[PDB]
Short mmCIF file of N, CA and C (backbone and C1' of nucleotides) in Angstrom, two decimals:
data_model
loop_
_atom_site.label_atom_id
_atom_site.label_comp_id
_atom_site.label_asym_id
_atom_site.label_seq_id
_atom_site.Cartn_x
_atom_site.Cartn_y
_atom_site.Cartn_z
N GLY U 6 -78.37 -106.71 -70.99
CA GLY U 6 -77.17 -106.21 -70.54
C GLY U 6 -76.07 -107.40 -70.34
N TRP U 7 -74.98 -107.04 -69.85
CA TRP U 7 -73.89 -107.91 -69.71
C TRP U 7 -73.64 -108.18 -68.17
N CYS U 8 -73.74 -109.58 -67.78
CA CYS U 8 -73.69 -110.00 -66.37
C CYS U 8 -72.19 -110.16 -65.85
N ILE U 9 -71.87 -109.65 -64.81
CA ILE U 9 -70.55 -109.73 -64.24
C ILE U 9 -70.69 -110.38 -62.95
N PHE U 10 -69.85 -111.42 -62.68
CA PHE U 10 -69.78 -112.18 -61.44
C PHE U 10 -68.53 -111.73 -60.69
N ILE U 11 -68.84 -111.45 -59.34
CA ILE U 11 -67.92 -110.92 -58.40
C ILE U 11 -67.86 -111.86 -57.14
N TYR U 12 -66.47 -112.46 -57.03
CA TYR U 12 -66.42 -113.43 -55.94
C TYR U 12 -65.45 -112.71 -54.81
N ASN U 13 -65.62 -113.28 -53.59
CA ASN U 13 -64.84 -112.67 -52.36
C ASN U 13 -65.41 -111.60 -51.83
N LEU U 14 -66.63 -111.21 -51.76
CA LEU U 14 -67.20 -110.13 -51.08
C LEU U 14 -67.16 -110.56 -49.65
N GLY U 15 -67.24 -109.71 -48.68
CA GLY U 15 -67.16 -110.23 -47.28
C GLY U 15 -68.53 -110.44 -46.76
N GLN U 16 -68.69 -111.01 -45.48
CA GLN U 16 -69.92 -111.42 -45.03
C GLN U 16 -70.82 -110.26 -44.76
N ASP U 17 -70.32 -109.07 -44.58
CA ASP U 17 -71.22 -107.92 -44.44
C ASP U 17 -71.42 -107.10 -45.72
N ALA U 18 -70.90 -107.60 -46.84
CA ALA U 18 -71.07 -106.91 -48.01
C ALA U 18 -72.62 -106.53 -48.32
N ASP U 19 -72.84 -105.36 -49.07
CA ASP U 19 -74.20 -104.87 -49.35
C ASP U 19 -74.06 -104.38 -50.81
N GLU U 20 -75.26 -104.21 -51.34
CA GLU U 20 -75.37 -103.85 -52.78
C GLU U 20 -74.63 -102.49 -53.04
N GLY U 21 -74.80 -101.57 -51.94
CA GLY U 21 -74.05 -100.31 -51.90
C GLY U 21 -72.72 -100.44 -52.52
N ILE U 22 -71.94 -101.50 -51.87
CA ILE U 22 -70.54 -101.53 -52.39
C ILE U 22 -70.29 -101.78 -53.82
N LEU U 23 -71.16 -102.71 -54.36
CA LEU U 23 -71.10 -102.94 -55.86
C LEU U 23 -71.55 -101.77 -56.65
N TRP U 24 -72.57 -100.95 -56.20
CA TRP U 24 -72.81 -99.82 -57.02
C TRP U 24 -71.71 -98.92 -57.02
N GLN U 25 -71.11 -98.73 -55.83
CA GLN U 25 -69.95 -97.76 -55.73
C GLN U 25 -68.81 -98.19 -56.53
N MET U 26 -68.48 -99.44 -56.72
CA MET U 26 -67.35 -99.89 -57.44
C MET U 26 -67.65 -99.87 -58.91
N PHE U 27 -68.67 -100.29 -59.45
CA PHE U 27 -69.10 -100.41 -60.76
C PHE U 27 -69.72 -99.19 -61.39
N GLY U 28 -70.49 -98.50 -60.66
CA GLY U 28 -71.03 -97.22 -61.18
C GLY U 28 -70.07 -96.33 -61.85
N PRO U 29 -68.87 -96.03 -61.30
CA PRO U 29 -67.97 -95.19 -62.03
C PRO U 29 -67.47 -95.61 -63.44
N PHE U 30 -67.76 -96.80 -63.85
CA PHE U 30 -67.27 -97.31 -65.12
C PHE U 30 -68.25 -97.25 -66.27
N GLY U 31 -69.59 -96.89 -66.06
CA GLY U 31 -70.61 -96.96 -67.06
C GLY U 31 -71.94 -97.20 -66.53
N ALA U 32 -72.93 -97.45 -67.51
CA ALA U 32 -74.25 -97.56 -67.11
C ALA U 32 -74.42 -98.95 -66.41
N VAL U 33 -75.09 -98.94 -65.24
CA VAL U 33 -75.10 -100.18 -64.55
C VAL U 33 -76.61 -100.42 -64.19
N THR U 34 -77.28 -101.42 -64.59
CA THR U 34 -78.76 -101.51 -64.43
C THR U 34 -79.27 -102.36 -63.32
N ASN U 35 -78.40 -103.25 -62.64
CA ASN U 35 -78.68 -103.96 -61.56
C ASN U 35 -77.53 -104.55 -60.77
N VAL U 36 -77.63 -104.67 -59.42
CA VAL U 36 -76.62 -105.22 -58.73
C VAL U 36 -77.36 -106.13 -57.69
N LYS U 37 -76.66 -107.16 -57.34
CA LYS U 37 -77.21 -108.11 -56.47
C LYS U 37 -76.10 -108.85 -55.53
N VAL U 38 -76.38 -108.86 -54.23
CA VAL U 38 -75.43 -109.63 -53.41
C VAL U 38 -76.17 -110.94 -53.08
N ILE U 39 -75.53 -112.06 -53.25
CA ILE U 39 -76.12 -113.34 -52.88
C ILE U 39 -76.12 -113.62 -51.37
N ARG U 40 -77.10 -113.99 -50.82
CA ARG U 40 -77.05 -114.36 -49.31
C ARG U 40 -77.82 -115.55 -49.10
N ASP U 41 -77.37 -116.17 -47.88
CA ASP U 41 -78.01 -117.43 -47.39
C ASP U 41 -79.40 -117.05 -46.82
N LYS U 42 -76.46 -113.50 -44.26
CA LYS U 42 -75.01 -113.27 -44.52
C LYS U 42 -74.70 -113.59 -45.92
N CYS U 43 -73.80 -112.77 -46.54
CA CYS U 43 -73.46 -112.80 -47.89
C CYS U 43 -72.67 -114.28 -48.14
N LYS U 44 -73.04 -114.83 -49.21
CA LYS U 44 -72.39 -116.23 -49.60
C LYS U 44 -71.05 -115.99 -50.07
N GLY U 45 -70.44 -114.77 -50.20
CA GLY U 45 -69.16 -114.61 -50.83
C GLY U 45 -69.18 -114.05 -52.17
N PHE U 46 -70.32 -113.90 -52.90
CA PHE U 46 -70.41 -113.47 -54.27
C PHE U 46 -71.49 -112.57 -54.53
N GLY U 47 -71.47 -112.03 -55.68
CA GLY U 47 -72.70 -111.19 -56.26
C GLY U 47 -72.59 -110.88 -57.65
N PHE U 48 -73.51 -110.13 -58.28
CA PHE U 48 -73.60 -109.89 -59.67
C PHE U 48 -73.87 -108.47 -59.99
N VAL U 49 -73.39 -108.07 -61.03
CA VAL U 49 -73.67 -106.65 -61.64
C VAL U 49 -74.02 -106.78 -62.98
N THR U 50 -74.93 -106.01 -63.55
CA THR U 50 -75.32 -106.01 -64.91
C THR U 50 -75.07 -104.61 -65.63
N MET U 51 -74.29 -104.61 -66.58
CA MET U 51 -73.94 -103.36 -67.18
C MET U 51 -74.28 -103.31 -68.66
N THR U 52 -74.78 -102.17 -69.18
CA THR U 52 -75.43 -102.09 -70.46
C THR U 52 -74.38 -102.30 -71.64
N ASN U 53 -73.21 -101.74 -71.43
CA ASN U 53 -72.35 -101.43 -72.63
C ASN U 53 -71.15 -102.53 -72.51
N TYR U 54 -71.04 -103.35 -73.59
CA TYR U 54 -69.97 -104.40 -73.43
C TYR U 54 -68.58 -103.80 -73.15
N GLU U 55 -68.10 -102.81 -73.76
CA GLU U 55 -66.96 -102.12 -73.49
C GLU U 55 -66.80 -101.68 -72.06
N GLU U 56 -67.79 -101.02 -71.53
CA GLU U 56 -67.64 -100.62 -70.19
C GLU U 56 -67.59 -101.72 -69.20
N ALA U 57 -68.47 -102.79 -69.48
CA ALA U 57 -68.23 -103.87 -68.53
C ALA U 57 -66.86 -104.56 -68.59
N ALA U 58 -66.33 -104.65 -69.90
CA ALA U 58 -64.89 -105.18 -70.05
C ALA U 58 -64.01 -104.13 -69.12
N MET U 59 -64.17 -102.88 -69.27
CA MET U 59 -63.32 -102.06 -68.41
C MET U 59 -63.43 -102.28 -66.92
N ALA U 60 -64.71 -102.38 -66.57
CA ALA U 60 -64.85 -102.60 -65.03
C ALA U 60 -64.15 -103.91 -64.68
N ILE U 61 -64.36 -105.03 -65.49
CA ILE U 61 -63.78 -106.28 -65.23
C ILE U 61 -62.31 -106.16 -65.20
N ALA U 62 -61.59 -105.52 -66.17
CA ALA U 62 -60.25 -105.57 -66.17
C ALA U 62 -59.60 -104.72 -65.18
N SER U 63 -60.42 -103.72 -64.59
CA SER U 63 -59.95 -102.80 -63.57
C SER U 63 -60.10 -103.29 -62.22
N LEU U 64 -61.10 -104.06 -62.03
CA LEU U 64 -61.61 -104.48 -60.56
C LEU U 64 -61.09 -105.85 -60.23
N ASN U 65 -60.82 -106.69 -61.24
CA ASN U 65 -60.34 -108.07 -61.04
C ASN U 65 -59.11 -107.86 -60.27
N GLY U 66 -58.90 -108.47 -59.09
CA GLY U 66 -57.62 -108.41 -58.33
C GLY U 66 -57.65 -107.20 -57.29
N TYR U 67 -58.76 -106.50 -57.32
CA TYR U 67 -58.93 -105.50 -56.29
C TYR U 67 -58.92 -105.99 -54.81
N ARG U 68 -58.32 -105.27 -53.99
CA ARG U 68 -58.44 -105.71 -52.50
C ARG U 68 -59.49 -105.02 -51.87
N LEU U 69 -60.72 -105.69 -51.62
CA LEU U 69 -61.68 -105.09 -50.91
C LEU U 69 -61.62 -105.41 -49.32
N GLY U 70 -61.33 -104.43 -48.65
CA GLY U 70 -61.14 -104.59 -47.26
C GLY U 70 -59.75 -105.39 -47.03
N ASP U 71 -59.79 -106.64 -46.92
CA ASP U 71 -58.53 -107.44 -47.02
C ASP U 71 -58.71 -108.69 -47.72
N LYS U 72 -59.58 -108.80 -48.67
CA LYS U 72 -59.85 -109.85 -49.64
C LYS U 72 -59.44 -109.43 -50.95
N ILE U 73 -59.02 -110.47 -51.78
CA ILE U 73 -58.79 -110.16 -53.24
C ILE U 73 -59.88 -110.50 -54.09
N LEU U 74 -60.67 -109.50 -54.66
CA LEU U 74 -61.82 -109.88 -55.44
C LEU U 74 -61.48 -110.65 -56.78
N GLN U 75 -62.35 -111.49 -57.20
CA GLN U 75 -62.30 -112.10 -58.45
C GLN U 75 -63.46 -111.47 -59.23
N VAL U 76 -63.24 -110.88 -60.37
CA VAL U 76 -64.29 -110.32 -61.17
C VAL U 76 -64.26 -110.72 -62.61
N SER U 77 -65.34 -111.22 -63.19
CA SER U 77 -65.30 -111.66 -64.54
C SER U 77 -66.66 -111.77 -65.17
N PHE U 78 -66.70 -111.97 -66.50
CA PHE U 78 -68.01 -112.15 -67.14
C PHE U 78 -68.71 -113.33 -66.57
N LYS U 79 -69.95 -113.27 -65.97
CA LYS U 79 -70.68 -114.49 -65.51
C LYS U 79 -70.74 -115.69 -66.51
N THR U 80 -70.43 -116.72 -65.98
CA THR U 80 -70.64 -118.04 -66.77
C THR U 80 -71.87 -118.76 -66.58
N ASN U 81 -72.28 -119.75 -67.22
CA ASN U 81 -73.47 -120.60 -67.02
C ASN U 81 -73.20 -121.69 -65.96
N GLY O 19 -67.85 -84.55 -60.46
CA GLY O 19 -68.63 -84.47 -61.66
C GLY O 19 -69.75 -83.51 -61.51
N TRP O 20 -71.00 -83.87 -62.16
CA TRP O 20 -72.13 -83.12 -62.33
C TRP O 20 -73.10 -83.52 -61.24
N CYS O 21 -73.57 -82.57 -60.51
CA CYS O 21 -74.40 -82.97 -59.32
C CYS O 21 -75.85 -82.77 -59.71
N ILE O 22 -76.76 -83.70 -59.51
CA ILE O 22 -78.16 -83.69 -59.83
C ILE O 22 -79.06 -83.76 -58.72
N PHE O 23 -79.92 -82.77 -58.53
CA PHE O 23 -80.91 -82.70 -57.51
C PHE O 23 -82.29 -83.39 -57.82
N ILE O 24 -82.78 -84.27 -57.04
CA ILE O 24 -84.05 -84.99 -57.31
C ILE O 24 -84.97 -84.72 -55.95
N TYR O 25 -86.13 -84.16 -56.33
CA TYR O 25 -87.18 -83.96 -55.48
C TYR O 25 -88.46 -84.80 -55.70
N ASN O 26 -89.17 -85.09 -54.58
CA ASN O 26 -90.31 -86.03 -54.60
C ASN O 26 -89.99 -87.63 -54.35
N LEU O 27 -88.76 -87.82 -53.87
CA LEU O 27 -88.57 -89.21 -53.28
C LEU O 27 -89.61 -89.51 -52.09
N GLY O 28 -90.01 -90.70 -51.96
CA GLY O 28 -90.84 -90.99 -50.72
C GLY O 28 -90.17 -90.91 -49.31
N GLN O 29 -90.88 -90.99 -48.20
CA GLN O 29 -90.23 -90.82 -46.95
C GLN O 29 -89.26 -92.06 -46.66
N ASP O 30 -89.63 -93.17 -47.14
CA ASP O 30 -88.67 -94.30 -46.86
C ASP O 30 -87.71 -94.67 -48.03
N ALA O 31 -87.46 -93.63 -48.83
CA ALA O 31 -86.47 -93.87 -49.93
C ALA O 31 -85.11 -94.13 -49.33
N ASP O 32 -84.39 -94.93 -50.04
CA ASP O 32 -82.91 -95.23 -49.74
C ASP O 32 -82.05 -95.16 -51.00
N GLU O 33 -80.77 -95.13 -50.73
CA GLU O 33 -79.83 -94.99 -51.82
C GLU O 33 -80.09 -95.80 -53.12
N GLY O 34 -80.53 -97.09 -52.81
CA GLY O 34 -80.92 -97.92 -53.84
C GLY O 34 -81.72 -97.42 -54.89
N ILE O 35 -82.74 -96.67 -54.59
CA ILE O 35 -83.55 -96.01 -55.63
C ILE O 35 -82.89 -95.12 -56.57
N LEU O 36 -81.96 -94.32 -55.96
CA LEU O 36 -81.22 -93.35 -56.73
C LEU O 36 -80.30 -94.25 -57.78
N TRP O 37 -79.64 -95.24 -57.29
CA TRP O 37 -78.80 -96.04 -58.12
C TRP O 37 -79.73 -96.59 -59.25
N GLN O 38 -80.83 -97.16 -58.86
CA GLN O 38 -81.62 -97.84 -59.94
C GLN O 38 -82.11 -96.81 -60.98
N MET O 39 -82.56 -95.53 -60.54
CA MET O 39 -82.96 -94.53 -61.47
C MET O 39 -81.83 -93.95 -62.45
N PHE O 40 -80.75 -93.74 -61.95
CA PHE O 40 -79.72 -93.05 -62.64
C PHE O 40 -78.71 -93.83 -63.20
N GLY O 41 -78.38 -95.06 -62.57
CA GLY O 41 -77.48 -96.06 -63.13
C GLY O 41 -77.57 -96.36 -64.68
N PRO O 42 -78.94 -96.54 -65.21
CA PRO O 42 -78.96 -96.88 -66.53
C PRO O 42 -78.50 -95.80 -67.56
N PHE O 43 -78.42 -94.64 -67.12
CA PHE O 43 -78.01 -93.56 -67.90
C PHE O 43 -76.43 -93.31 -68.16
N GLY O 44 -75.62 -93.91 -67.39
CA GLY O 44 -74.29 -93.64 -67.44
C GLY O 44 -73.58 -93.81 -66.17
N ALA O 45 -72.20 -93.43 -66.17
CA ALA O 45 -71.41 -93.42 -64.89
C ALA O 45 -71.95 -92.64 -63.79
N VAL O 46 -72.29 -93.16 -62.68
CA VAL O 46 -72.81 -92.58 -61.48
C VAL O 46 -71.75 -92.96 -60.39
N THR O 47 -71.18 -91.87 -59.78
CA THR O 47 -69.98 -92.12 -58.88
C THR O 47 -70.55 -92.11 -57.33
N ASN O 48 -71.63 -91.52 -57.13
CA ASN O 48 -72.18 -91.24 -55.77
C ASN O 48 -73.68 -90.91 -55.84
N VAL O 49 -74.43 -91.27 -54.72
CA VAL O 49 -75.77 -90.92 -54.57
C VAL O 49 -75.94 -90.64 -53.04
N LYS O 50 -77.02 -89.81 -52.77
CA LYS O 50 -77.35 -89.50 -51.32
C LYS O 50 -78.74 -89.18 -51.07
N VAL O 51 -79.39 -89.81 -50.14
CA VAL O 51 -80.67 -89.38 -49.78
C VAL O 51 -80.64 -88.44 -48.62
N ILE O 52 -81.36 -87.36 -48.56
CA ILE O 52 -81.24 -86.54 -47.41
C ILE O 52 -82.30 -86.81 -46.43
N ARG O 53 -82.01 -87.04 -45.24
CA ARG O 53 -83.06 -87.46 -44.11
C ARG O 53 -83.10 -86.50 -43.10
N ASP O 54 -84.29 -86.43 -42.41
CA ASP O 54 -84.36 -85.77 -41.20
C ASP O 54 -83.53 -86.58 -40.08
N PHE O 55 -82.57 -85.98 -39.43
CA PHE O 55 -81.69 -86.73 -38.55
C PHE O 55 -82.58 -87.33 -37.43
N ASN O 56 -83.49 -86.67 -36.90
CA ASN O 56 -84.26 -87.08 -35.77
C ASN O 56 -85.45 -87.94 -35.95
N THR O 57 -85.86 -88.31 -37.26
CA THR O 57 -86.94 -89.28 -37.57
C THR O 57 -86.24 -90.42 -38.49
N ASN O 58 -85.11 -90.06 -39.02
CA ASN O 58 -84.47 -90.89 -40.07
C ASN O 58 -85.38 -91.09 -41.28
N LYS O 59 -86.40 -90.18 -41.53
CA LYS O 59 -87.25 -90.29 -42.78
C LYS O 59 -86.52 -89.34 -43.79
N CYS O 60 -86.69 -89.78 -45.07
CA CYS O 60 -86.31 -89.02 -46.17
C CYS O 60 -87.04 -87.69 -46.22
N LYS O 61 -86.31 -86.55 -46.38
CA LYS O 61 -87.06 -85.29 -46.57
C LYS O 61 -87.74 -85.02 -47.85
N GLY O 62 -87.51 -85.98 -48.73
CA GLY O 62 -88.24 -85.89 -50.02
C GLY O 62 -87.14 -85.58 -51.20
N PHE O 63 -85.91 -85.55 -50.86
CA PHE O 63 -84.94 -85.16 -51.93
C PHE O 63 -83.63 -85.83 -51.80
N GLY O 64 -82.80 -85.90 -52.86
CA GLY O 64 -81.62 -86.56 -52.86
C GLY O 64 -80.78 -85.88 -53.92
N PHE O 65 -79.44 -86.37 -54.00
CA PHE O 65 -78.36 -85.88 -54.93
C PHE O 65 -77.79 -87.16 -55.60
N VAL O 66 -77.39 -86.96 -56.86
CA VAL O 66 -76.71 -87.94 -57.49
C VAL O 66 -75.55 -87.33 -58.27
N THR O 67 -74.41 -87.93 -58.34
CA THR O 67 -73.24 -87.33 -59.09
C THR O 67 -72.91 -88.10 -60.30
N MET O 68 -72.97 -87.63 -61.53
CA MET O 68 -72.67 -88.32 -62.75
C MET O 68 -71.36 -87.62 -63.40
N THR O 69 -70.56 -88.50 -64.06
CA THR O 69 -69.28 -88.12 -64.47
C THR O 69 -69.34 -87.28 -65.76
N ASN O 70 -70.38 -87.71 -66.64
CA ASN O 70 -70.41 -87.18 -67.96
C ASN O 70 -71.63 -86.14 -68.12
N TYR O 71 -71.23 -84.97 -68.62
CA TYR O 71 -72.35 -83.99 -68.76
C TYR O 71 -73.54 -84.45 -69.62
N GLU O 72 -73.29 -84.96 -70.73
CA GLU O 72 -74.30 -85.49 -71.66
C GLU O 72 -75.21 -86.56 -71.02
N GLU O 73 -74.63 -87.43 -70.30
CA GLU O 73 -75.35 -88.59 -69.60
C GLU O 73 -76.12 -88.01 -68.56
N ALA O 74 -75.59 -87.09 -67.80
CA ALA O 74 -76.40 -86.35 -66.70
C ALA O 74 -77.64 -85.61 -67.36
N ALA O 75 -77.37 -85.04 -68.47
CA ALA O 75 -78.41 -84.21 -69.05
C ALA O 75 -79.56 -85.13 -69.48
N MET O 76 -79.10 -86.29 -69.99
CA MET O 76 -80.08 -87.38 -70.57
C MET O 76 -80.85 -87.92 -69.42
N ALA O 77 -80.21 -88.22 -68.22
CA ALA O 77 -80.89 -88.60 -67.06
C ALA O 77 -82.00 -87.58 -66.61
N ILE O 78 -81.51 -86.37 -66.52
CA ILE O 78 -82.42 -85.23 -66.16
C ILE O 78 -83.57 -85.14 -66.99
N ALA O 79 -83.48 -85.14 -68.27
CA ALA O 79 -84.51 -84.94 -69.30
C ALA O 79 -85.47 -86.13 -69.23
N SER O 80 -84.87 -87.36 -68.96
CA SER O 80 -85.79 -88.62 -69.00
C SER O 80 -86.63 -88.61 -67.63
N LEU O 81 -86.04 -88.31 -66.70
CA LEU O 81 -86.57 -88.54 -65.28
C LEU O 81 -87.42 -87.43 -64.71
N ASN O 82 -87.19 -86.27 -65.28
CA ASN O 82 -87.91 -84.96 -64.70
C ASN O 82 -89.34 -85.14 -65.28
N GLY O 83 -90.22 -85.14 -64.32
CA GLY O 83 -91.61 -85.15 -64.76
C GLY O 83 -92.17 -86.59 -64.76
N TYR O 84 -91.24 -87.51 -64.33
CA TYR O 84 -91.63 -88.90 -64.42
C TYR O 84 -92.15 -89.41 -62.99
N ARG O 85 -92.91 -90.48 -62.92
CA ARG O 85 -93.67 -90.74 -61.72
C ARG O 85 -92.90 -91.80 -60.93
N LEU O 86 -92.72 -91.64 -59.59
CA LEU O 86 -92.20 -92.48 -58.72
C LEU O 86 -93.24 -92.54 -57.50
N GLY O 87 -93.81 -93.84 -57.41
CA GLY O 87 -94.91 -93.99 -56.48
C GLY O 87 -96.10 -93.19 -56.94
N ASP O 88 -96.68 -92.33 -56.03
CA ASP O 88 -97.88 -91.54 -56.52
C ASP O 88 -97.36 -89.91 -56.77
N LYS O 89 -96.12 -89.87 -56.87
CA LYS O 89 -95.51 -88.48 -56.91
C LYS O 89 -94.80 -88.24 -58.37
N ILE O 90 -94.74 -86.92 -58.77
CA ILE O 90 -94.11 -86.65 -60.03
C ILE O 90 -92.69 -86.12 -59.72
N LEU O 91 -91.63 -86.71 -60.25
CA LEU O 91 -90.26 -86.33 -59.89
C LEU O 91 -89.91 -84.99 -60.42
N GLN O 92 -89.16 -84.23 -59.62
CA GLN O 92 -88.54 -83.02 -60.31
C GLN O 92 -87.04 -83.37 -60.20
N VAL O 93 -86.40 -83.29 -61.39
CA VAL O 93 -85.04 -83.63 -61.55
C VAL O 93 -84.37 -82.40 -62.31
N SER O 94 -83.26 -81.91 -61.67
CA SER O 94 -82.64 -80.79 -62.32
C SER O 94 -81.14 -80.66 -61.85
N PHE O 95 -80.25 -79.96 -62.44
CA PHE O 95 -78.85 -79.76 -61.98
C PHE O 95 -78.94 -78.97 -60.52
N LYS O 96 -78.11 -79.53 -59.60
CA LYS O 96 -78.28 -78.85 -58.33
C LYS O 96 -77.88 -77.43 -58.47
N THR O 97 -78.42 -76.54 -57.66
CA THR O 97 -78.33 -75.11 -57.43
C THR O 97 -77.20 -74.76 -56.43
P A S 8 -95.50 -79.66 -48.97
"O5'" A S 8 -94.29 -80.02 -47.96
"C5'" A S 8 -93.00 -80.30 -48.42
"C4'" A S 8 -91.91 -79.90 -47.57
"C3'" A S 8 -90.48 -79.78 -48.19
"O3'" A S 8 -89.72 -78.85 -47.39
"C1'" A S 8 -90.53 -81.37 -46.55
P U S 9 -89.47 -77.37 -48.08
"O5'" U S 9 -88.52 -77.75 -49.42
"C5'" U S 9 -87.28 -78.39 -49.18
"C4'" U S 9 -86.42 -78.21 -50.28
"C3'" U S 9 -86.16 -76.69 -50.69
"O3'" U S 9 -84.91 -76.52 -51.09
"C1'" U S 9 -87.23 -77.87 -52.51
P U S 10 -83.84 -75.87 -50.16
"O5'" U S 10 -82.59 -76.64 -50.49
"C5'" U S 10 -82.20 -77.94 -50.05
"C4'" U S 10 -81.07 -78.48 -50.85
"C3'" U S 10 -79.86 -77.48 -51.00
"O3'" U S 10 -78.69 -78.22 -51.11
"C1'" U S 10 -80.87 -78.00 -53.11
P U S 11 -77.62 -78.08 -49.98
"O5'" U S 11 -77.74 -79.67 -49.19
"C5'" U S 11 -78.82 -80.09 -48.50
"C4'" U S 11 -78.45 -81.04 -47.46
"C3'" U S 11 -77.44 -80.53 -46.39
"O3'" U S 11 -77.79 -81.14 -45.16
"C1'" U S 11 -76.63 -82.46 -47.55
P U S 12 -78.99 -80.70 -44.28
"O5'" U S 12 -79.71 -81.97 -43.89
"C5'" U S 12 -79.29 -82.89 -42.87
"C4'" U S 12 -79.20 -84.27 -43.57
"C3'" U S 12 -78.79 -85.42 -42.56
"O3'" U S 12 -79.86 -85.92 -41.85
"C1'" U S 12 -77.38 -85.51 -44.44
#
RNA sequence: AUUUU
């Protein structure tokens, strides 16, 4: 699948929130919030390149709570 | 969208399992595990909502009769 | 535990 990196999750962020945000865009096979409390970021894996691109183009810049998310294809 | 009923979840099932099971089939907008309010245990069933009829049907056909833990899932469109 | 907690 295609790995998506999401920055600016809040300290209380949970996997639930990622599923709820990305699920509506296409097939999602995995989500993970990175923790030490959340470290501020997490990942989602989507099967279909086009749907991943949609989720990314749609959710980058989204205000979650009162923080501005950064969403993009994961880099190495 | 299209509401899917799932029976034979375990007592400690949580939303996470419904996402993992139905997520790979297409757009899922919502999941819900039904619990007994007074024990907080799962009553054995849950609901998932999928946007696209064909993808919901594919999820239903692939998961119905499939094993989760020691149990056989029953998956169908909600009545 | 069979169709909303």
